[model samples]
Target: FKVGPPFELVRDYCPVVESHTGRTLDLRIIPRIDRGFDHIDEEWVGYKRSYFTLVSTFETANCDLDTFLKSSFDLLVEDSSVEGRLRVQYFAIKIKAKNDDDDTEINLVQHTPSVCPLVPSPLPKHQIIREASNVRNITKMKKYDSTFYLHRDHVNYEEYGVDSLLFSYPEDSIQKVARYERVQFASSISVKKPSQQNKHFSLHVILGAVVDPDGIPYDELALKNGSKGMFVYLQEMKTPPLIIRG
Candidate 1:
């Protein structure tokens, strides 16, 4: 799911400190957005189907940081393609009291971080769109049109994953707008406020929106209840959470 963001955080009340003992931060995801339970009022953010890899640096074939950090006098947000898993970093603030100190130390160290999800080669749906990147508009239009006729039901509920909030949004205000469009939740990130005990605050993440590990799309599966024949469950209503990733 390509999550678009006006990213907002619901931070923990407590402070976080970097420890010499190597203590790490953890975030527990409370699945589904229950407005009564959470403090934030925003509907488009938080605890939904979402996932994305985090990195300490930008994706590059080989990031020779010791050399690169020295020549580079400024910090910048690079492309999403970088492999920064395990290592942690923070946004650089100019002239801050506590800073990265001419490049402070960080490493994934000891290969202790959990293994990441292994994303396979592009699925057929992904491949179709990728090959369209350079194509003429008419050609791409035809390809999309075919899915409408073939999998209309499946495609329609695809956006349902992003509609969890609209079900509860203020009635009149929601009716005024007319787009069901929104991104699925891929993950949640929390950066702790810095504490006096340590110079750097910690980051925690929770991944969501994984595909059913069984590899069956909900619409394709028949209901298991006593009802006979091939009646299927609604794809969007399927409760599976630990499933597909990409």
Candidate 2:
């Protein structure tokens, strides 16, 4: 797998701070591929699968004070070679807030903040796949359940139904920030590549501020003729061939 260069989806100057110190806050999305499994035969039976953890880091710096009503991160898989090959197995967000009691919590995962699922149904898509159950009813509710109605074209994945994974910050904890805050959205994806013949695919990760009727404000300016977010592409390639002879 090859990771592409980061592209600016949206850029805007944050609200200026009125203080004698004089400083500015900068926000950026940093993407990292933690690890991957080359070839796994047992997970999905006949199909050989590859699993990887794609992480997006949201970091703020240069000043101690900064805030946003809400923010979101979206993930999509673009595969012209295979229509329904990629599936999101797990998703979670971890927040490392500064100026908090570091000694109070023993495990960081337990105290991590929660993010709302903005895209796809809460139903068990991964379960259905693992069990190989019939998906007729689930397919019927694709429009109402899995798909994002507003932006249908981007997020709609054929029968798999989870091309778009959108995670956002909750309302109550959306205010204020420490001198330095690091928010990470970590998700695992499984790719079905039965044979070495099939290979082309790209993963798209987008990050942006949320603007909604519920009063979440959009504070970022468009990045010079770009969309209202930041995004990048992770291109997939064939791994080294397996040595076991069939």
* TM-score of predicted structure 2: 0.27
lDDT (Cα atoms) of all candidates against the true structure: 0.22, 0.26
Tens-digit lDDT string for candidate 2 (79-196): 4422222222112122221211121211112112322212212222323322322344665535333221223234323422222222222221221111111222222212223675
- Using lDDT as the measure, which candidate wins? 2
Per-structure clash totals for the candidates: 13, 0
> Against the hidden true structure, what lDDT does model 2 obtain?
0.26
Candidate 1: tens digits of C-alpha lDDT, residues 58-145: 1112323222221211111123622222111111100000112222222221111221111111113333433433356887757644
On the 0 to 100 scale, the lDDT of residue 246 in model 1 is 20
Stretches of candidate 1 off by over 4 Å are 1-125, 132-136, 148-190, 193-246
Task: Assess the local accuracy of residue 113 in candidate 2 as a C-alpha lDDT between 0 and 100.
Answer: 34
**What TM-score does structure 1 among the candidates reach?**
0.17
Clashes of 1: 13
List runs of model 2 lying over 4 Å from the truth: 1-25, 37-48, 65-197, 214-246
